[PDB]
Amino acid sequence: AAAPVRLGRKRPLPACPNPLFVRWLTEWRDEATRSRRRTRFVFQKALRSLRRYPLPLRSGKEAKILQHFGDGLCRMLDERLQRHRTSGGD
Numbered sequence: 047a048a049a050p051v052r053l054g055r056k057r058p059l060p061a062c063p064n065p066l067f068v069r070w071l072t073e074w075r076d077e078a079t080r081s082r083r084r085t086r087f088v089f090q091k092a093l094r095s096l097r098r099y100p101l102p103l104r105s106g107k108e109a110k111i112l113q114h115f116g117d118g119l120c121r122m123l124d125e126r127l128q129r130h131r132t133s134g135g136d
Contacts, residue, residue: 061100070126071096085118092119 062068071093078089095114102108106124109115115123 062097
């Protein structure tokens, strides 16, 4: 039906398993790879660091405190949450 994610109980486990964050980061990850730009490397590392951090990410501010998120990333990801929030939130 959908693409089977090859997963498991392998470590390091994702400290942020939040379906909102997990999805939109993976969407923009494959899109950053699709763009073939520098945005690929900086975003993929930012994705790792976001889901590496066991913090209560409920807003874009908890993404801003990561220095692995560049100023450009902190903008676009804060907007990703905000636009979807105004669209319904779920």
